[PDB]
Structure 1
Amino acid sequence: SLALSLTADQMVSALLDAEPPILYSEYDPTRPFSEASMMGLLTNLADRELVHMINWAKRVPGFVDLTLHDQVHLLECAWLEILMIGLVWRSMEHPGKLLFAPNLLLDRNQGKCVEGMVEIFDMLLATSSRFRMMNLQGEEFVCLKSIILLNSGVYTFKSLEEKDHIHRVLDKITDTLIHLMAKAGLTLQQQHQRLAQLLLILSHIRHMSNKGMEHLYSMKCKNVVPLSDLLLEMLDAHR
């Protein structure tokens, strides 16, 4: 496979080239804003982002080597994590605000329009401020996002030869993260420390996704926020 034959810079090149675009929302600033309209905007945006995420996953090295059943499984458990880390990355340069779209910037005050959303908003803000303090690089972000895709579902799977292949790709991404930090002048002690700090953030992203997934499972029962057929299939994959 070409995934195990890629160098570090070639890995970064492939990941940077496969980046999905930043989509716009249908946000009308003049129009009044109900709790159901804000969620309608967030649902519409996330549904369109999902289509791009699926084609982005195809371009992640090693992902196409997997069986079709495993690709479905990895995306079903990781899709919200990937949306959330993308949101957090876009919001680094906007302290106290979440850039859902270039025309949709929300602070924690607007997040209060949806009940229970406040806690998830604050965790996303805290993750965004952590990236800002660490000065996370774009080359490091695409590595982390691809780690989430390959790691988040590998322990939720007779012939586990495909599981061993995912770990070989994960190790190559680790080599790529280290190659980036050594390129930026960090010492060996600094490289290992930064690598650990980044991967520990993925634990909190999993936490946010789990808490977010159960907030989405309740709004489906309320039937007030519209839910697309793809998102309902993604949401039912966790229940």
Structure 2
Amino acid sequence: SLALSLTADQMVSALLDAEPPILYSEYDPTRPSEASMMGLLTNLADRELVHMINWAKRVPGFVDLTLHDQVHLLECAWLEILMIGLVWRSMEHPGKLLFAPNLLLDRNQGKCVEGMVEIFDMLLATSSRFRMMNLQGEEFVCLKSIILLNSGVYTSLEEKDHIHRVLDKITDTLIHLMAKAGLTLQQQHQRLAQLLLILSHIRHMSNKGMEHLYSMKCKVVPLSDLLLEMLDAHR
């Protein structure tokens, strides 16, 4: 009942106040391999997963759901949420992806692991896309919560209409923010459409990344037991 009762600014406050921290990697610049970089990124994503799970419980309405539903939404959206966060961190670093403050990688270093290059370029294009749009942090936290609630919603239970009720609320928040920035009604709609079309590409990168991840398993730095469980959820 709380999520439906919040206001637009009350929405932005909770989301902004719920932001997980930017974690550091175990990267050592004294050493340059493919396996080294691969194990670094998966170790970081594993530690980020713990913060995301407790971040999701801070997302308005998410704790009103059954827990079978919370598992499913996170199992389907976790890599999307990691990717959009990475892309947001990298906005002010053209040509580079900021996986962590001590780990800033560009194209040539991303090619060190096979198949990573294409996903690397898609992540760069997304971060560059957020750069042209001048994406605001208030809009980012809104998009990230939309990914959590929308990615698994299409997979008796009255919980779906509640989720869509939360989703419409977040749309009102995004529109409320764009009106504050002095956009016209036509500008608010176009910008709302542009932001949501990015989520289609973020879904695409996630599917591609999830399959390159399941091959890294079958191929060799192992992954954490949490990452393997999240990976079994997609396979």
Common topology (TM > 0.5): yes
Structure 1 residue 94: Cα displacement:
0.1
2:221 aligns to what? 225
Structure 1 distance, partners of 2:137, 2:111, is 31
Structure 2 distance, partners of 1:57, 1:194, is 25
Deviations 1:17-45 (A, max 9, x none): 0000000001000123x100101100110
Runs of 4+ in structure 1 over 6 Å off:
none
2:158 aligns to what? 161
Structure 2 distance, partners of 1:130, 1:238, is 28
Structure 1 residue 225: Cα displacement:
2.0
Matched, 1:27 2:30: no
* Correspondences of 1:68-217 after superposition (within 5 Å): 68-156=67-155, 159-217=156-214
Structure 1 distance, partners of 2:157, 2:107, is 44
Structure 2 distance, partners of 1:15, 1:220, is 34
1:6 aligns to what? 6
Structure 1 distance, partners of 2:31, 2:36, is 10
Structure 2 distance, partners of 1:226, 1:108, is 24
Structure 2 distance, partners of 1:30, 1:212, is 28
Structure 1 residue 73: Cα displacement:
0.2
The alignment of Structure 1 onto Structure 2 pairs a total of residues equal to: 235
Structure 2 distance, partners of 1:47, 1:219, is 15
Structure 1 distance, partners of 2:195, 2:166, is 18
SS at match of 2:2: coil
Structure 1 residue 160: Cα displacement:
2.4
Structure 1 residue 4: Cα displacement:
0.2
Structure 2 distance, partners of 1:78, 1:42, is 18
Percent pairwise identity = 100
Structure 2 distance, partners of 1:229, 1:137, is 35
Structure 1 distance, partners of 2:95, 2:12, is 30
SS at match of 1:106: strand
Structure 2 distance, partners of 1:166, 1:136, is 25
Structure 1 residue 69: Cα displacement:
0.2
Structure 1 residue 196: Cα displacement:
0.1
Structure 2 distance, partners of 1:131, 1:112, is 23
Deviations 1:184-204 (A, max 9, x none): 000000000000000000000
Q: Structure 2 stretches of 5 or more lacking a match?
A: none
Structure 1 distance, partners of 2:84, 2:31, is 29
Normalising by the residue count of structure 1, what TM-score does the alignment of the two structures yield? 0.98
SS at match of 2:104: strand
Q: Structure 1 stretches of 5 or more lacking a match?
A: none
Structure 1 residue 226: Cα displacement:
1.8
Structure 1 distance, partners of 2:37, 2:231, is 19
